[PDB]
Amino acid sequence: DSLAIKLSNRPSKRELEEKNILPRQTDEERLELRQQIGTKLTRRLSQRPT
Amino acid sequence: CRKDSLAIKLSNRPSKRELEEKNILPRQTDEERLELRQQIGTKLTRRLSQRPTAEELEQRNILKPRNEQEEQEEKREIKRRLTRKLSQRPTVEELRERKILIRFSDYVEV
Amino acid sequence: TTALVCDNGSGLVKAGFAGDDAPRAVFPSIVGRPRSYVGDEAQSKRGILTLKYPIEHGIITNWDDMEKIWHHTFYNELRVAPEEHPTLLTEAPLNPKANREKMTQIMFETFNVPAMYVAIQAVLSLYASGRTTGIVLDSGDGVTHNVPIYEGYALPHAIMRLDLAGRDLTDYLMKILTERGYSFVTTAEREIVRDIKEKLCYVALDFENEMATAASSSSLEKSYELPDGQVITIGNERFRCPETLFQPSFIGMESAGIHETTYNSIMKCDIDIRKDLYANNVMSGGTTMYPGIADRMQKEITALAPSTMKIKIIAPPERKYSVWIGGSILASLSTFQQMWITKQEYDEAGPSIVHRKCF
Amino acid sequence: TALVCDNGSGLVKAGFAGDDAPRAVFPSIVGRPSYVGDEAQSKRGILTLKYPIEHGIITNWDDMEKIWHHTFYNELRVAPEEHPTLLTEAPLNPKANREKMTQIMFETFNVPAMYVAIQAVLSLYASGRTTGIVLDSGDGVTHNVPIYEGYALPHAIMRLDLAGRDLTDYLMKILTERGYSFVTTAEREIVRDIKEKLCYVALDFENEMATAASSSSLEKSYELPDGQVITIGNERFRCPETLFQPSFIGMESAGIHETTYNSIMKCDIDIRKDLYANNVMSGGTTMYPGIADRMQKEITALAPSTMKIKIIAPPERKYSVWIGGSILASLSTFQQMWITKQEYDEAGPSIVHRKCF
Amino acid sequence: TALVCDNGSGLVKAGFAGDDAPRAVFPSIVGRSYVGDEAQSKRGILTLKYPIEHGIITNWDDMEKIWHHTFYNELRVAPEEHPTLLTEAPLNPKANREKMTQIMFETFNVPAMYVAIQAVLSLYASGRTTGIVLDSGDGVTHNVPIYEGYALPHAIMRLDLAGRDLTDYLMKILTERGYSFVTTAEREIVRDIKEKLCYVALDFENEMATAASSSSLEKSYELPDGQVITIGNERFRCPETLFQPSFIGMESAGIHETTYNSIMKCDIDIRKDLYANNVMSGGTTMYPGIADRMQKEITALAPSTMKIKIIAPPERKYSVWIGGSILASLSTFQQMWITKQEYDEAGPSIVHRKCF
Amino acid sequence: TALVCDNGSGLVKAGFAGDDAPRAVFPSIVGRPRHQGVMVGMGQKDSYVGDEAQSKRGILTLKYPIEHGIITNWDDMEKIWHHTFYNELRVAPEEHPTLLTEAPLNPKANREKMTQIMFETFNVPAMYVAIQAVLSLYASGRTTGIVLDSGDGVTHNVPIYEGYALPHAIMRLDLAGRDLTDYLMKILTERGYSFVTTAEREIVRDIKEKLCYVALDFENEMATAASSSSLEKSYELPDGQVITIGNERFRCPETLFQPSFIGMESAGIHETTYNSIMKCDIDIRKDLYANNVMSGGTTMYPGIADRMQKEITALAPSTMKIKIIAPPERKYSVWIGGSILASLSTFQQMWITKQEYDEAGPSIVHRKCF
Ligand SMILES: Nc1ncnc2c1ncn2[C@@H]1O[C@H](COP(=O)(O)OP(=O)(O)OP(=O)(O)O)[C@@H](O)[C@H]1O
Ligand SMILES: Nc1ncnc2c1ncn2[C@@H]1O[C@H](COP(=O)(O)OP(=O)(O)OP(=O)(O)O)[C@@H](O)[C@H]1O
Ligand SMILES: Nc1ncnc2c1ncn2[C@@H]1O[C@H](COP(=O)(O)OP(=O)(O)OP(=O)(O)O)[C@@H](O)[C@H]1O
Ligand SMILES: Nc1ncnc2c1ncn2[C@@H]1O[C@H](COP(=O)(O)OP(=O)(O)OP(=O)(O)O)[C@@H](O)[C@H]1O
Ligand SMILES: [Mg+2]
Numbered sequence A: 001d002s003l004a005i006k007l008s009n010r011p012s013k014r015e016l017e018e019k020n021i022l023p024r025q026t027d028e029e030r031l032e033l034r035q036q037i038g039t040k041l042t043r044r045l046s047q048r049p050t
Numbered sequence B: 001c002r003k004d005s006l007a008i009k010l011s012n013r014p015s016k017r018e019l020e021e022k023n024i025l026p027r028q029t030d031e032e033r034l035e036l037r038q039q040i041g042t043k044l045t046r047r048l049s050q051r052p053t054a055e056e057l058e059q060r061n062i063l064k065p066r067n068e069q070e071e072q073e074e075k076r077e078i079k080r081r082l083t084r085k086l087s088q089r090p091t092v093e094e095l096r097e098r099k100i101l102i103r104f105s106d107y108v109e110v
Numbered sequence C: 001t002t003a004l005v006c007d008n009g010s011g012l013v014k015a016g017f018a019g020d021d022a023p024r025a026v027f028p029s030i031v032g033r034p035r036s037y038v039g040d041e042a043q044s045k046r047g048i049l050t051l052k053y054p055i056e057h058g059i060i061t062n063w064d065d066m067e068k069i070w071h072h073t074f075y076n077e078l079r080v081a082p083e084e085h086p087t088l089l090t091e092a093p094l095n096p097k098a099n100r101e102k103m104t105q106i107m108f109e110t111f112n113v114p115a116m117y118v119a120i121q122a123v124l125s126l127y128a129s130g131r132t133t134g135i136v137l138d139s140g141d142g143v144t145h146n147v148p149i150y151e152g153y154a155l156p157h158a159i160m161r162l163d164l165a166g167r168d169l170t171d172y173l174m175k176i177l178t179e180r181g182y183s184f185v186t187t188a189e190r191e192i193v194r195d196i197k198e199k200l201c202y203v204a205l206d207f208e209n210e211m212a213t214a215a216s217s218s219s220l221e222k223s224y225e226l227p228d229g230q231v232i233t234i235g236n237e238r239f240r241c242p243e244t245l246f247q248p249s250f251i252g253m254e255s256a257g258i259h260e261t262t263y264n265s266i267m268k269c270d271i272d273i274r275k276d277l278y279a280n281n282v283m284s285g286g287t288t289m290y291p292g293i294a295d296r297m298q299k300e301i302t303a304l305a306p307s308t309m310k311i312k313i314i315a316p317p318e319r320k321y322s323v324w325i326g327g328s329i330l331a332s333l334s335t336f337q338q339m340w341i342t343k344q345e346y347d348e349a350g351p352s353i354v355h356r357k358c359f
Numbered sequence D: 001t002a003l004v005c006d007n008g009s010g011l012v013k014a015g016f017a018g019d020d021a022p023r024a025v026f027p028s029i030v031g032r033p034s035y036v037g038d039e040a041q042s043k044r045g046i047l048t049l050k051y052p053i054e055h056g057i058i059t060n061w062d063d064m065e066k067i068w069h070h071t072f073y074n075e076l077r078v079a080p081e082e083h084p085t086l087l088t089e090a091p092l093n094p095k096a097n098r099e100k101m102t103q104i105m106f107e108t109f110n111v112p113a114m115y116v117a118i119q120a121v122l123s124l125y126a127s128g129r130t131t132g133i134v135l136d137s138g139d140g141v142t143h144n145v146p147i148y149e150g151y152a153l154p155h156a157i158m159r160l161d162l163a164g165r166d167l168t169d170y171l172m173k174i175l176t177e178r179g180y181s182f183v184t185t186a187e188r189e190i191v192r193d194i195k196e197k198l199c200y201v202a203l204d205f206e207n208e209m210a211t212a213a214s215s216s217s218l219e220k221s222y223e224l225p226d227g228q229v230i231t232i233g234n235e236r237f238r239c240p241e242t243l244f245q246p247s248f249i250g251m252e253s254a255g256i257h258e259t260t261y262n263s264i265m266k267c268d269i270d271i272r273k274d275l276y277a278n279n280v281m282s283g284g285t286t287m288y289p290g291i292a293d294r295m296q297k298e299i300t301a302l303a304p305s306t307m308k309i310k311i312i313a314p315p316e317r318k319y320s321v322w323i324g325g326s327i328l329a330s331l332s333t334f335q336q337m338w339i340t341k342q343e344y345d346e347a348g349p350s351i352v353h354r355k356c357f
Numbered sequence E: 001t002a003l004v005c006d007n008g009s010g011l012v013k014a015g016f017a018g019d020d021a022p023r024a025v026f027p028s029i030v031g032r033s034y035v036g037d038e039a040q041s042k043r044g045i046l047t048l049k050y051p052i053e054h055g056i057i058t059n060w061d062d063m064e065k066i067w068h069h070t071f072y073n074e075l076r077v078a079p080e081e082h083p084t085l086l087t088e089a090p091l092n093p094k095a096n097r098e099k100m101t102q103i104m105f106e107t108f109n110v111p112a113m114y115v116a117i118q119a120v121l122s123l124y125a126s127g128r129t130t131g132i133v134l135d136s137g138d139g140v141t142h143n144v145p146i147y148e149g150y151a152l153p154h155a156i157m158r159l160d161l162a163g164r165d166l167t168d169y170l171m172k173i174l175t176e177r178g179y180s181f182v183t184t185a186e187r188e189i190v191r192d193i194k195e196k197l198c199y200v201a202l203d204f205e206n207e208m209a210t211a212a213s214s215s216s217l218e219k220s221y222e223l224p225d226g227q228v229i230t231i232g233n234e235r236f237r238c239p240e241t242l243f244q245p246s247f248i249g250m251e252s253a254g255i256h257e258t259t260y261n262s263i264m265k266c267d268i269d270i271r272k273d274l275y276a277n278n279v280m281s282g283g284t285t286m287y288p289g290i291a292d293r294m295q296k297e298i299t300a301l302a303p304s305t306m307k308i309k310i311i312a313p314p315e316r317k318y319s320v321w322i323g324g325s326i327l328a329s330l331s332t333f334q335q336m337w338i339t340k341q342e343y344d345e346a347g348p349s350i351v352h353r354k355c356f
Numbered sequence F: 001t002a003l004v005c006d007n008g009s010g011l012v013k014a015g016f017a018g019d020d021a022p023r024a025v026f027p028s029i030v031g032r033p034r035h036q037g038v039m040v041g042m043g044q045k046d047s048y049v050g051d052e053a054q055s056k057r058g059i060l061t062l063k064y065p066i067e068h069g070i071i072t073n074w075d076d077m078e079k080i081w082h083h084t085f086y087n088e089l090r091v092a093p094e095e096h097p098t099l100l101t102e103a104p105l106n107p108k109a110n111r112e113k114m115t116q117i118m119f120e121t122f123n124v125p126a127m128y129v130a131i132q133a134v135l136s137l138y139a140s141g142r143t144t145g146i147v148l149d150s151g152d153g154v155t156h157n158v159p160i161y162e163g164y165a166l167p168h169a170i171m172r173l174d175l176a177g178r179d180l181t182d183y184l185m186k187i188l189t190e191r192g193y194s195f196v197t198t199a200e201r202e203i204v205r206d207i208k209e210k211l212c213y214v215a216l217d218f219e220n221e222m223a224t225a226a227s228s229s230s231l232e233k234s235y236e237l238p239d240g241q242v243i244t245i246g247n248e249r250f251r252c253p254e255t256l257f258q259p260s261f262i263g264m265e266s267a268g269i270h271e272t273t274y275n276s277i278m279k280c281d282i283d284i285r286k287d288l289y290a291n292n293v294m295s296g297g298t299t300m301y302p303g304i305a306d307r308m309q310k311e312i313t314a315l316a317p318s319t320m321k322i323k324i325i326a327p328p329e330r331k332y333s334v335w336i337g338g339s340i341l342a343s344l345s346t347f348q349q350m351w352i353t354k355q356e357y358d359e360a361g362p363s364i365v366h367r368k369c370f
């Protein structure tokens, strides 16, 4: 009787990915992404105006 | 009926994505197409201007000069000569005697 | 040598190692003394002992308690020797000079760190997404800020501060759930309601329309089972709760909502960079985790801005910790290694050095 | 304005340099009681039709001259002496063959300039690359051509006499096995159209066969000109499956993924990474939906576990060869590259080898 | 009336939706055709193959034989007359479940079917949709963290150490005792001894010391031949392998450690929900004392103030099946079934979308 | 089928005997987490090897097991060999004879430890240890000549007579490819391009491999570079940024001939070649001069053979016949040599069998391998 109640309140898979509960990318993907972001950050901070 | 030829035709229609991949529905502006073609053109002119010569590519072991059979021949000949050279190999003592191994206690483990 | 990253929240401390994708330890910023325990252990013993909040509205107010928190962070949570690691700390926007000077002094003298740095939370939030220009909405437990940043420089004249955040939303949810007839007056009850807020709340795209939907059918209703096994049904409270961020008048505040403060922050900046600010709205902090908030912000900002302005709201799922992530990235950059304030430099210039070295 | 001519085994693609797409595309057939292309197909009943280009190599020079004449005068409506002309050629095209192409272009058509480019190389250029491996699958022939800095690597080139025409034939056979009869040439054209509109490459062939046998989800309907309606099931993916399993038509040859891998392996190990990361697909027979994903899967299955694999297959690929030419001939730095009429007059057919490489 | 089928590495559990227990439970073996107990009886004359190893179907023909035996021989039903809920292992490949669907619709002509993850059904059986399940059966052990009915694939832990391996180890230690246990029948006897007399020690060193100090832990088992044997520390050394896999030459961490690791791979926010909800399911979790030991170990690994609760009901040996039995009997589940018409329309693809 | 493993300071080359090229080439690095991860339990995946380690470089600290050609970290070396057998070649080490390469002047205790580890840890049925430069010589079908082997971490001159390396005349130079990459980074940085980051270092390495060459006359080439843009070349970065490189193309590898460019007092590779030749008996010098074999990646620069010819001609007697041998395959010639050697029929007696190792221990390698 509690089960069905808990089944009515189930989030969508998207809605779970939104909460950072289900990863949307492989570990390798997150790593490549991090490296990219890092090189970007490096480049931008390099030409940072005064 | 005719509405059945139509119903059978409607049921079959692909997605918009499917037409897109088939290049029936373009994914970009004629302007964007122009941008892309320009970028391609300039990258191309650059790489072509930098393009190395055939002999420069042969000395890099990318462009193979010898034919399959000719290469097989050189490989076989290398094996042959290496064997014939390795069999006729002197002793450490024979070299020590010939003032070739200046140091004693070098190769004495043999 | 591995650098450390410490984000000092009013409600939650996020701590970990530079280069890591997520903070190793996340714990409540409370200090407990008999009527010493810190964080979760303090919360467990909360009945036995009185609790003090060292960080209020993002700014450090009790230094002894803060030293206790930092000790607990290094030794109990991260299991490291502070003298063996460069340390990146976060600070609130508009943090007073004396405050950051004291941060530096305590880090070098008390904990004997070989190096340290102090970064603005919103700036780190911007950095975590690989950007150096944009406007950040950082909403945590105790305070909410809009911070416009151009090329890594926060623009102090255009910063907006709002003392409405997650804790206030929890209180409001308690109030409106109480009006419905469920009693949530007690602290334990406050915790169950806070969990309810985290699990069931969302931001309506059109508030009036969502109210109408809630009045029209039971479609929005959801059920939550309390620890006592009692079952409750929640309807419009789901979206009325975070609506307070857009309509602070819900709790008797005269302040404009976060969309309006975002717009005002943008307007206080020079017109030329304004386009760059609109296209880069980064949301960070736990109170930005409500589903639908990005879309709502998009709609409202589009509604206030010129009709053709390109608006982009950036709200990754990890945003609740994005501040920390930024630090983790920043402190892990090779080019950042020169940026650290070394202990020798601190010996030479004293607390003064942080102002020149960090910006 | 320069001209671009892609001499397909099945279709001639012709147009002007700088244009995004070829002005004229027509079948490469010559009809004799002379009719070329579309007109020959229209007159196909009255006269027997012959294919001058078979498996990508020019074999009948009179008919080829007829095709080029029709191209210049009837299709593009230009005077050949007023335009530099870029022609395409197949990979591993014999020296004498390209020499004859050059000789005919200068002496018969009196062009002020011309150039001969490898089709696969042009395909690579169209995507803005000069290094990578091209799978060029057309009407008559399929090639794997690895290319470094614009140079095709002859020792690693794979040739497969399995292409679109063969797939059409196989589709006729299997549709016949299903019980629909397609023996005549007009019926053949109908089957080709069925192939182009309804066929696709299954990602997992066994699972797709099982799916086709389990349910009608894959079934499609084609309305014949007679208004008869036919149903096609697994033939949709069994047809192009032949590319990966040539044994379907009695060939002992390896499939296109295996030939891609082998071609890659025949190249020096140092450039191999560069080859894996740049697979360009070109030609009409690469137009089947799902072929890129299948190729990704198979190449991933053959290559080292950590190797980066990238398949490049733009929607425009069916004409990408031509597009490459169109780009190349419109580049300013290319203008020096042309073989001028004076140079040809001086060196003869020999010059193409030196000037084009 | 719907059917519920749990496809175990060792035992198939089959029955009707709404029932308290599976109607039929039998070993999942194929003899070359003979299936299960009958196959075991004729095991001498013909060679026997295990279609399901470590929870994943590997021999489809044999699986079809097993399913045929399930529908016709065990349950006495016509498969075209019943919706069928099948179970699958955690991290079951897409092609595998697609093949399950294909076989169910094409071979057995079922009007409807569904595929559920075993650990999730185990969780539902306890009335939960959020928690972490330790499912240890005959061929494989899994840790499966689940949030709101969704299994979290990235955090699932697989261990190829289970009940059969424990039986083998018990045989090994019995060899150490001076008793010879080589035969299949003898293997069955040892399995029964393990199920009846084994338990999980709360403190392994202390229990070893108790075993060394006196005959107090020793117990006696009477064999079918009427011979009487005495078992001492073997009672707890056997299931200790679960906590110390190094006992059988495995480098893998123990089940408490894999539980902790599974919890750690999840988002920090859900960890509290996971710690407070450990559900144990499967036959290899039936050992007395296992819950207390797991409680102690997880408490030892987790933060000092974290609330830990281990849930291990008596019915757990069949709880997977029970979950399915519950699930297929809910009114709200009725829309969830993949109908034969729908399968006809979309094919095997539908199972991925419809079932989650 | 025998295996061939060339254990480089920078790159491991591994493959099967009889094959024309190594099946697997990967960086010789072992990566270990910087700090204890949030993961408890025996059988943890501690340590990453090669490509995966380079990809994961941010998360974990990286260690070079082989520096200047000599193995210094044995645990990490075991990790590399395990990865070689199982991940890269996909073989069972107990099922294959294994030929390993070693650096010139590799210590006795060191090779003894190599043999011991191979037999006890990997249970190979047979193995052999060959000098890299000697294999390089063998690959060209020679057993006598002088080899210049320049890799990632170290450069050697190794004179060899009748298959015997002559230890007293071997020259070692701690200047190689890695040092050249660093120098190229330095001079490009001086130009105003910033190459401080590791990714930038990899990019500079690629620039070195693609665009650098050895000038026949350094001063003349400097003058040409100053006179016109004719020598200038262009490199496109991964971010699509475009940079122009001028004299750096030949100033970088010029360091090999003028080590003073990086502050070293050592003689250049031509001078060390000459010295190595002179330390050998006078009777063999003619045979050495006529057989200079170059091997290793750092010998891949276009023009290096010609420059070497010029310098050696300048140092040697006026009438001496000088021949420099530098085939296109030289980057892997060491490995190739091994592949050939282990595939010879006459080599079959030469393997150290597991039984022989059982009888004599680590000691046996000295008698059996030479
Ligand atoms: N999924 C969620 N939905 C709604 N609110 C959430 C969610 N998760 C966390 N929160 C709220 O976010 C708040 C935590 O925010 P955060 O830890 O960023 O604050 P802080 O950094 O400690 O405060 P400050 O930034 O003022 O110093 C909590 O009050 C909690 O109620
Ligand atoms: N959309 C499509 N899907 C599948 N196949 C197609 C499609 N469009 C065309 N084809 C096939 O591609 C073939 C024509 O390809 P293409 O024009 O590249 O050949 P070609 O260049 O004339 O021949 P070759 O490359 O051998 O010289 C035709 O045989 C046709 O069957
Ligand atoms: N009371 C008990 N004590 C100890 N072990 C038991 C007990 N009951 C059953 N087992 C063991 O549990 C196993 C059967 O459990 P279960 O039915 O969960 O396995 P399964 O689900 O078929 O396996 P899998 O999940 O790997 O497919 C048998 O190997 C048996 O030895
Ligand atoms: N074409 C090229 N031009 C210039 N340098 C190159 C080229 N190819 C490779 N290299 C360099 O050669 C080095 C690798 O050479 P090699 O693999 O022979 O060294 P190694 O055997 O790993 O080192 P060692 O011999 O010291 O153990 C790399 O540092 C690389 O930069
Ligand atoms: Mg914050």
Ligand SMILES: [Mg+2]
Residues within 6 Å of the ligand: D006, D007, D008, D119, D136, D138, D283, D321
């Ligand atoms: Mg073509």
Ligand SMILES: [Mg+2]
Residues within 6 Å of the ligand: E006, E007, E008, E118, E137, E282, E320
């Ligand atoms: Mg089970």
Ligand SMILES: [Mg+2]
Residues within 6 Å of the ligand: F006, F008, F132, F149, F151, F296, F334
């Ligand atoms: Mg080497």
